[PDB]
Design an enzyme around this catalytic site. Structure first.
Site, PDB file in Angstrom:
ATOM      1  N   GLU A   1       0.801  -1.220   0.000  1.00  0.00           N
ATOM      2  CA  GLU A   1       0.000   0.000   0.000  1.00  0.00           C
ATOM      3  C   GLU A   1       0.838   1.277   0.000  1.00  0.00           C
ATOM      4  O   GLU A   1       0.393   2.263  -0.612  1.00  0.00           O
ATOM      5  CB  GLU A   1      -0.977  -0.018   1.185  1.00  0.00           C
ATOM      6  CG  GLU A   1      -2.096  -1.037   1.008  1.00  0.00           C
ATOM      7  CD  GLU A   1      -3.158  -0.949   2.086  1.00  0.00           C
ATOM      8  OE1 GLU A   1      -3.334  -1.936   2.825  1.00  0.00           O
ATOM      9  OE2 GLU A   1      -3.819   0.108   2.192  1.00  0.00           O
TER      10      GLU A   1
ATOM     11  N   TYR B   1     -15.095  -2.638   9.536  1.00  0.00           N
ATOM     12  CA  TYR B   1     -15.322  -1.632   8.505  1.00  0.00           C
ATOM     13  C   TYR B   1     -16.654  -0.923   8.704  1.00  0.00           C
ATOM     14  O   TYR B   1     -16.773   0.271   8.407  1.00  0.00           O
ATOM     15  CB  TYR B   1     -15.259  -2.271   7.119  1.00  0.00           C
ATOM     16  CG  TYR B   1     -13.852  -2.532   6.636  1.00  0.00           C
ATOM     17  CD1 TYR B   1     -12.847  -1.597   6.839  1.00  0.00           C
ATOM     18  CD2 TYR B   1     -13.524  -3.717   5.988  1.00  0.00           C
ATOM     19  CE1 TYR B   1     -11.558  -1.828   6.402  1.00  0.00           C
ATOM     20  CE2 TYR B   1     -12.237  -3.958   5.549  1.00  0.00           C
ATOM     21  CZ  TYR B   1     -11.259  -3.008   5.759  1.00  0.00           C
ATOM     22  OH  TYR B   1      -9.973  -3.239   5.325  1.00  0.00           O
TER      23      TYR B   1
ATOM     24  N   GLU C   1     -15.835  27.065  -3.511  1.00  0.00           N
ATOM     25  CA  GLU C   1     -15.593  27.735  -2.238  1.00  0.00           C
ATOM     26  C   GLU C   1     -14.692  26.909  -1.329  1.00  0.00           C
ATOM     27  O   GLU C   1     -13.956  27.475  -0.510  1.00  0.00           O
ATOM     28  CB  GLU C   1     -16.926  28.042  -1.555  1.00  0.00           C
ATOM     29  CG  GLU C   1     -16.866  29.202  -0.580  1.00  0.00           C
ATOM     30  CD  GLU C   1     -18.192  29.929  -0.456  1.00  0.00           C
ATOM     31  OE1 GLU C   1     -19.037  29.780  -1.366  1.00  0.00           O
ATOM     32  OE2 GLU C   1     -18.386  30.642   0.553  1.00  0.00           O
TER      33      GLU C   1
HETATM   34  N1  LIG Z   1     -12.151   2.998   6.387  1.00  0.00           N
HETATM   35  C1  LIG Z   1     -12.305   1.999   5.521  1.00  0.00           C
HETATM   36  N2  LIG Z   1     -11.203   1.504   4.864  1.00  0.00           N
HETATM   37  C2  LIG Z   1     -11.339   0.492   3.980  1.00  0.00           C
HETATM   38  C3  LIG Z   1     -12.581  -0.066   3.719  1.00  0.00           C
HETATM   39  N3  LIG Z   1     -12.409  -1.047   2.807  1.00  0.00           N
HETATM   40  C4  LIG Z   1     -11.095  -1.118   2.490  1.00  0.00           C
HETATM   41  N4  LIG Z   1     -10.423  -0.175   3.219  1.00  0.00           N
HETATM   42  C5  LIG Z   1      -8.986   0.124   3.187  1.00  0.00           C
HETATM   43  O1  LIG Z   1      -8.570   0.135   1.839  1.00  0.00           O
HETATM   44  C6  LIG Z   1      -7.299  -0.465   1.701  1.00  0.00           C
HETATM   45  C7  LIG Z   1      -7.394  -1.606   0.696  1.00  0.00           C
HETATM   46  O2  LIG Z   1      -7.884  -1.117  -0.530  1.00  0.00           O
HETATM   47  P1  LIG Z   1      -9.325  -1.529  -1.122  1.00  0.00           P
HETATM   48  O3  LIG Z   1     -10.250  -0.336  -1.235  1.00  0.00           O
HETATM   49  O4  LIG Z   1      -9.952  -2.604  -0.268  1.00  0.00           O
HETATM   50  O5  LIG Z   1      -8.922  -2.123  -2.570  1.00  0.00           O
HETATM   51  P2  LIG Z   1      -9.731  -1.771  -3.919  1.00  0.00           P
HETATM   52  O6  LIG Z   1      -9.915  -0.278  -4.058  1.00  0.00           O
HETATM   53  O7  LIG Z   1     -11.072  -2.470  -3.901  1.00  0.00           O
HETATM   54  O8  LIG Z   1      -8.818  -2.330  -5.130  1.00  0.00           O
HETATM   55  P3  LIG Z   1      -8.505  -3.908  -5.363  1.00  0.00           P
HETATM   56  O9  LIG Z   1      -7.064  -4.201  -5.012  1.00  0.00           O
HETATM   57  O10 LIG Z   1      -8.729  -4.231  -6.819  1.00  0.00           O
HETATM   58  O11 LIG Z   1      -9.431  -4.735  -4.499  1.00  0.00           O
HETATM   59  C8  LIG Z   1      -6.891  -0.973   3.070  1.00  0.00           C
HETATM   60  O12 LIG Z   1      -5.978  -0.053   3.625  1.00  0.00           O
HETATM   61  C9  LIG Z   1      -8.178  -0.968   3.864  1.00  0.00           C
HETATM   62  O13 LIG Z   1      -7.942  -0.664   5.216  1.00  0.00           O
HETATM   63  C10 LIG Z   1     -13.699   0.429   4.373  1.00  0.00           C
HETATM   64  O14 LIG Z   1     -14.810  -0.054   4.155  1.00  0.00           O
HETATM   65  N5  LIG Z   1     -13.552   1.463   5.277  1.00  0.00           N
END
Ligand SMILES: Nc1nc2c(ncn2[C@@H]2O[C@H](COP(=O)(O)OP(=O)(O)OP(=O)(O)O)[C@@H](O)[C@H]2O)c(=O)[nH]1
Ligand SMILES: Nc1ncnc2c1ncn2[C@@H]1O[C@H](COP(=O)(O)OP(=O)(O)CP(=O)(O)O)[C@@H](O)[C@H]1O
Ligand SMILES: Nc1nc2c(ncn2[C@@H]2O[C@H](COP(=O)(O)OP(=O)(O)O)[C@@H](O)[C@H]2O)c(=O)[nH]1
Ligand SMILES: COc1ccc(NC(=O)CN)cc1
Ligand SMILES: [Ca+2]
Ligand SMILES: [Ca+2]
Ligand SMILES: [Ca+2]
Ligand SMILES: [Mg+2]
Ligand SMILES: [Mg+2]
Ligand SMILES: [Mg+2]
Lengths: 54, 352, 438, 428
Positions: C183, C224, C254
């Site tokens: 990440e 989540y 704004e």
């Molecule tokens: N706050 C919050 N963070 C999330 C949630 N779902 C995933 N994350 C965060 O998003 C990151 C992982 O990325 P994802 O959004 O799950 O991946 P994606 O955008 O679906 O892309 P892919 O790799 O194709 O699955 C991690 O750091 C998770 O903690 C959520 O529902 N709420």
């Protein structure tokens, strides 16, 4: 500590307090990036298949 | 089993604390780049505070307060005292100081000349001293022209402050001196004062008719052990400790080190540290801070105490490393990471 | 009335998007079936809530939103969830296999094949707007879609909507709710190619939401769902000005004017208070001074950093509930004398204040307690650069060994893009230091 | 609908593959005849990952059984769940492979490979979105080793962008059938290093020592060894077979476990492993301690002899997820020297509410550790001891192979060892 631009409506109000005054890539260029990366993937895979064919 | 990292190999104090930590068989030292640590003995400059307190499942603690430099920089301290209402510009225990930028670069040049001309016209003692943090480079002079021309020849910020023309002189010797106090502030922001201080004495007789020979005016242990010819005569290493200094104050002045000097020192330490507490406190922060400070004081012939400077990375008197370092582990480290008296400190209670 | 279109990209954007539109409906009195009794103009209107909801001849209020995910399991919860009736099928877009946490895979490999479809659907919403303001793009930094496909969409949005503003809501990666080692790579890659396309981005550090949920809501191990309901509260506070009558932050333009004097430094810090547990016996309601003072406690910030050691460029106080201007200024005066608020010299030392009388709405059966007054402070501090520093440090550790780089190159990305994106972050960190340090 | 196609080749491969489908079939509520008789929807949530759905609500494993002799697969078809397999998915010959890698890869195997690929292609063409393939096999024999790696080569040629996973049993002289096992294993490792995305290294000696020293089985059998593999295979595929806050995608798993393409060889582990004091509850601390103990790992490689590049832990059952995170963080912080510091947060933890059969809770361990090099060092040593005298080489040169091919395989495996050792000494 001055209040300026005070607005009041039925659902709230807003204002500003001033404590102290002061002292892109085109559509074509994007297609070239995407197609450049695609061409590199096709080349890498072709090398894999050339290897496996050997 | 607690873990710590070392990032200032040149620290004599924390080299001993690190030696004691491992000696308890319950602390483990890691490589300086390993992020999973409970304790950080960090570098003096550019300590990455922003990367602390972000490891899940770890309570992290650092031996420096982010922001304490405001108190430990020559120029920053002068600005802090003049601009902080808690200290005010009329602060009685700090010499009249001014921040002066070299002309090759706000600046208090004109404000200094106004008070200088006033003294010259009023037949008053008008001797000042110029110094900077970039010095080992200090100049003592009674003419404003020389002090200003000495700063322009350099390229860093300087500060000119009143030179104590009536310093308290020990006998025999008729010699100057300065007092060093060590102060430990823990994560809870309790201000502890080490019961042991040191007087760095000048082994040369004080001479108010020759500021050119800076060996009887600068009580530094380096200048006294390099340019002085009476080093180690009266006291070993030009260092007199509270026990001897106190008995001297009784035989000569019929007073005690507590009444005549220590009450004022404790007052100055409190005022300085309580002032910046809102700015550096780690009370509601994601990590915790503690730090050892070295306060340097002057005393005049009226038994009045003056604040010279505050050091953020101070060393200790060779004869006092063991006791003090152990004291750092007891109240600073073990208080957060307990292990499986009659304290050596003096808690300066205050209103948090 | 001018419309705002919301775009939710990836799992984080979609689930957060779902929690926001659930909250909007309860705020505007919209039922799951789309009906709104209070709306007396059936099948149309130019009310403040119409910036986020279109209307059909049958009185259904339809969100101006598009949901995009490269895999279908998250959006299927929307297709069959409580609010399945709000969105028509064209609004929910899903592929068959995701980006595998691989920026290059979501940007180049998969993005190239679905980008033109996403634009077509967005165009369908734009054609319903008589005066589109811009876009609000929700996504994560760490996901392969959230990072890779978003930056591609942001590029194309700047091409197809040149004069439109774009705000981000970005989820900053936190190890306590993340199973992706790469990440930090994705975060920097997407920040690099998105920087010049975003006019104002609100970063939410999952580590902060996690700790708020454990410290204030007594959630031993948040999920989540717990995180998103709290994040959507903050988002609602930030977007309320667009959906209700008022005079502060009335259009997306704004947000930039009041929060971003320097275009590259467009990452305001969000602070919210109070967060009270619903399971509590019963809380003593905090005053305007107590909730306003809380905005300067790091524990209620969306990103953990120390604003005492930065410099402010702007500050917005967004209140919701029983608040009058008198109490705000009285609390601020008390705080200026007790806090370390250092502004940059080329900006005024002031606070823009917004008050909406309607107290925050809470999802029944949720974790948040009903409070009488709350505030969300939006301040542009140089101290938020600490977050970039942390992220950049992890990047350097892996990139020095080239760890995982082969996965990105294998999808057609050049290794040079790594260092090109890293050098951009180094510049971004230099700008912060030149603005807030002496 | 992210389908996986399963392949089991050779004696070892089919006997371990058989028990695997036995274990997960029980977990998903499938009986020996393919009918579902569970009581929870979670059992069918991701059932299509490993099973196809036929008429009458039946569930047929997406598995292809391969061998060059009929014997082993005859046992499977007559075994407990033998009836559960697609009859057309049995592809076997009659000549056998004589524990000869050359026969499975070049001569006997080559004659049968096209018919296996026809079955693979048929299974794929009915996949809504094929994740990739998983193969179970041994490296010490001829069919699983020789023809198995040939299958992988041809599968990769036809599906170059799909993920290829294997569970590979590594030979040990202590648990040996023939003296040529080092030859066969070294030749296979050469294929795996190049063509697989993930390989779970299962060492027959580790399985033996666990059955003997821990499980207290006086005279372990292959059947006893396979109980451990079945249970371990069920653990590592828990993420793929059930729902949860985890994504669990073969490609996503590889991206997070493989920092460098050649270093995709994992050490698996399982806890508990109790002998028959078997009814006692196991606390989360106890789960985490054992799961990280060398005696609970199956590559016969002490992790204390290397460093972890990445780690993935899966906890199963109803347990304190707060207590889990605490115990996982405790193990890292109290042994941070065994985790490379240039990959931040390289330990990921997953949870699953459904425990294995007859266990309140369990924990499966997947480690990508540089300590695995000692496994290849053992093989490389046994290989060279024979190859330096060309002993037993005629079984291979008689099948058209040349000595040069052995030299190249050896050099690649030794290179692999050199890579592990360089990242084991790396620093920030
Ligand atoms: N706050 C919050 N963070 C999330 C949630 N779902 C995933 N994350 C965060 O998003 C990151 C992982 O990325 P994802 O959004 O799950 O991946 P994606 O955008 O679906 O892309 P892919 O790799 O194709 O699955 C991690 O750091 C998770 O903690 C959520 O529902 N709420
Ligand atoms: N205004 C003043 N009046 C009298 N003496 C002064 C003075 N300013 C400095 N000194 C002398 O200089 C010495 C301290 O110098 P200073 O502390 O400013 O330099 P420095 O910081 O590089 C040495 P250190 O940090 O170790 O104390 C004292 O011993 C004191 O005698
Ligand atoms: N764990 C386990 N290992 C086995 C089993 N059968 C054979 N082996 C091992 O596999 C190797 C022999 O390979 P084998 O599968 O019999 O050859 P193949 O039939 O030609 O593929 C030797 O190292 C054996 O120790 C089994 O049932 N379980
Ligand atoms: C479990 O099956 C076994 C197979 C072979 C052995 N022994 C040897 O390999 C010869 N030392 C032991 C056990
Ligand atoms: Ca209407
Ligand atoms: Ca733009
Ligand atoms: Ca034949
Ligand atoms: Mg000094
Ligand atoms: Mg996803
Ligand atoms: Mg055999």
């Amino acid at each position: 500590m001055e209040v300026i631009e005070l607005n009041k409506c039925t659902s709230g109000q807003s204002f500003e307090v001033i404590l102290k005054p002061p002292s892109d890539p085109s559509l074509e260029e994007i297609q070239k990036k995407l197609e450049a990366a695609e061409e590199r993937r096709k080349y890498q895979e072709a090398e894999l298949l050339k290897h496996l064919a050997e | 089993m607690y873990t710590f990292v070392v990032r200032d190999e040149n620290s004599s104090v924390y080299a001993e604390v690190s030696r004691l930590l491992l000696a308890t068989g319950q602390w483990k030292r890691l490589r300086k780049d390993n992020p999973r640590f409970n304790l950080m003995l960090g570098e003096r400059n550019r300590l990455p505070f922003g990367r602390l307190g972000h490891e899940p499942g770890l309570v992290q603690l650092v031996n420096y307060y982010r922001g304490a430099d405001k108190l430990c920089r020559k120029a920053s301290l002068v600005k802090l005292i003049k601009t902080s209402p808690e200290l005010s510009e009329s602060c009685t225990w700090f010499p009249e100081s001014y921040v002066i930028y070299p002309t090759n670069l706000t600046d208090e040049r004109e404000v200094f000349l106004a008070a200088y001309n006033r003294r010259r016209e009023g037949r008053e003692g008008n001797v000042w001293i110029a110094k900077s943090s970039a010095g080992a480079g200090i100049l003592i002079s009674s003419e404003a022209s020389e002090l200003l021309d000495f700063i322009d020849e350099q390229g860093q910020v300087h500060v000119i402050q009143k030179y104590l023309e009536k310093p308290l002189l020990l006998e025999p010797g008729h010699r100057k001196f300065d007092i060093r106090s060590w102060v430990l502030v823990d994560h809870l922001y309790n201000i502890y004062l080490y019961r042991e201080g040191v007087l760095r004495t000048s082994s040369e007789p004080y001479n108010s008719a020759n500021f050119q020979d800076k060996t009887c005016h600068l009580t530094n242990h380096c200048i006294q052990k390099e340019y002085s010819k009476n080093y180690g005569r009266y006291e070993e290493g030009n260092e007199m400790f509270f026990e001897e200094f106190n008995q001297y104050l009784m035989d000569a002045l019929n007073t005690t080190l507590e009444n005549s000097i220590l009450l004022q020192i404790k007052h100055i330490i409190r005022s300085c540290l309580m002032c910046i507490e809102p700015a550096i406190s780690t009370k509601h922060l994601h990590y915790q801070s503690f730090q050892l400070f070295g306060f340097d004081f002057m005393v005049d012939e009226e038994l009045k105490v003056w604040l010279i400077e505050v050091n953020g990375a101070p060393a200790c008197a060779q004869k006092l490393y063991a006791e003090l370092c152990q004291g750092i582990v007891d109240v600073a480290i073990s208080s957060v990471f307990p292990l499986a008296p009659t304290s050596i400190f003096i808690k300066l209670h205050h209103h948090h | 009335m001018r419309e705002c279109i919301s775009i939710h990209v990836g799992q984080a954007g979609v689930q957060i998007g779902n929690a926001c539109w659930e909250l909007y409906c309860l705020e505007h009195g919209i039922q799951p079936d789309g009906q709104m009794p209070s709306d007396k103009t059936i099948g149309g209107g130019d009310d403040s809530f119409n910036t986020f909801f279109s209307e059909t001849g049958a009185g259904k209020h339809v969100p101006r939103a598009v949901f995009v995910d490269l895999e279908p399991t998250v959006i299927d919860e929307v297709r069959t969830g409580t609010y399945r009736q709000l969105f028509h099928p064209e609004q929910l877009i899903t592929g068959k296999e995701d980006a595998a946490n691989n920026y290059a895979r979501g940007h180049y490999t998969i993005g190239k094949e679905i980008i033109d479809l996403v634009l077509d659907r967005i165009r369908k919403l734009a054609d319903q707007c008589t005066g589109l303001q811009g876009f609000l793009v929700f996504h994560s930094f760490g996901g392969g879609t959230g990072s890779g496909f978003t930056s591609l969409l942001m590029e194309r949005l700047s091409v197809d909507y040149g004069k439109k503003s774009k705000l981000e809501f970005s989820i900053y990666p936190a190890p306590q709710v993340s199973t992706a080692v790469v990440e930090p790579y994705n975060s920097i890659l997407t920040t690099h190619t998105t920087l010049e396309h975003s006019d104002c981005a609100f970063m939410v550090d999952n580590e902060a939401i996690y700790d708020i949920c454990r410290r204030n809501l007594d959630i031993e191990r948040p999920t989540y769902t717990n995180l998103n309901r709290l994040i959507s509260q903050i988002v609602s506070s930030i977007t309320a000005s667009l959906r209700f009558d008022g005079a502060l932050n009335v259009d997306l333009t704004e947000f930039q004017t009041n929060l971003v004097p320097y275009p590259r430094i467009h990452f305001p810090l969000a602070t919210y208070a109070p967060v009270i547990s619903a399971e509590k016996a019963y809380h003593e309601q905090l005053s305007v001074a107590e909730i306003t003072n809380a905005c300067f406690e790091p524990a209620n910030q969306m990103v953990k950093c120390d604003p005492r050691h930065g410099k402010y460029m702007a500050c917005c106080l967004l209140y919701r509930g029983d608040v009058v201007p008198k109490d705000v200024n009285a609390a601020i005066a008390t705080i200026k004398t007790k806090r370390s608020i250092q502004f940059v010299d080329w900006c005024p030392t002031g606070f823009k204040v917004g008050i909406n009388y309607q107290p925050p709405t809470v999802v029944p059966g949720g974790d948040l307690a009903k409070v009488q007054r709350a505030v969300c402070m939006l301040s542009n501090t140089t101290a938020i650069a600490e977050a970039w520093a942390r992220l950049d440090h992890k990047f350097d550790l892996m990139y020095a060994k080239r760890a995982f780089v082969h996965w990105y190159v294998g999808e057609g990305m050049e290794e040079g893009e790594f260092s090109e994106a890293r050098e951009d972050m180094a510049a971004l960190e230099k700008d912060y230091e030149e603005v807030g340090v002496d | 609908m992210r389908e996986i196609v399963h392949i089991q080749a050779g004696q070892c491969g089919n006997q371990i593959g058989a028990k695997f489908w036995e274990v997960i079939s029980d977990e998903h509520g499938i009986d020996p005849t393919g009918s579902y008789h569970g009581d929870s929807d979670l059992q069918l949530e991701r059932i299509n990952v490993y099973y196809n759905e036929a008429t009458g609500n039946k569930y047929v494993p997406r598995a292809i059984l391969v061998d060059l002799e009929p014997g082993t697969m005859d046992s499977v078809r007559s075994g407990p769940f033998g009836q559960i397999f697609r009859p057309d998915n049995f592809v076997f010959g009659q000549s056998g492979a004589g524990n000869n890698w050359a026969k499975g890869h070049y001569t006997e195997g080559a004659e049968l490979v096209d018919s296996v690929l026809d079955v693979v292609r048929k299974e794929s063409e009915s996949c809504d979105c094929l994740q990739g393939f998983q193969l179970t096999h041994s490296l010490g024999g001829g069919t699983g080793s020789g023809m198995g790696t040939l299958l992988i080569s041809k599968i990769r040629e036809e599906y170059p962008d799909r993920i290829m996973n294997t569970f590979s049993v590594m030979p040990s002289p202590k648990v040996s059938d023939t003296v040529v096992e080092p030859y066969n294993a070294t030749l296979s490792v050469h294929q795996l290093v190049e063509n697989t995305d993930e390989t779970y290294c299962i060492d027959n000696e580790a399985l033996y020592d666990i059955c003997f020293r821990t499980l207290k089985l006086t005279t372990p059998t292959y059947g006893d060894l396979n109980h451990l593999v079945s249970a371990t295979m069920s653990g590592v595929t828990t993420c793929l077979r059930f729902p949860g806050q985890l994504n669990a995608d073969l490609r996503k798993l590889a991206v997070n476990m493989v920092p460098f393409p050649r270093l995709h060889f994992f050490m698996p582990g399982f806890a508990p492993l109790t002998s028959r004091q078997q009814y006692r509850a196991l606390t989360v601390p106890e789960l985490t301690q054992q799961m990280f103990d060398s005696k609970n790992m199956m590559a016969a490689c002490d992790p204390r002899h290397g460093r972890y590049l990445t780690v993935a832990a899966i906890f199963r059952g109803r347990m304190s997820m707060k207590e889990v995170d605490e115990q996982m963080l405790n193990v890292q912080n109290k042994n941070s020297s065994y985790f490379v510091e240039w990959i931040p947060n390289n330990v990921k933890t997953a949870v699953c509410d459904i425990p294995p059969r007859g266990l309140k809770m369990s924990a499966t361990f997947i480690g990508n550790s540089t300590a695995i090099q000692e496994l290849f060092k053992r093989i490389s040593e046994q290989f060279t001891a024979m190859f330096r005298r060309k002993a037993f080489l005629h079984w291979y040169t008689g099948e058209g192979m040349d000595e040069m091919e052995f030299t190249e395989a050896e050099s690649n495996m030794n290179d692999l060892v050199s890579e592990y050792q360089q990242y084991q000494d790396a620093t920030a």
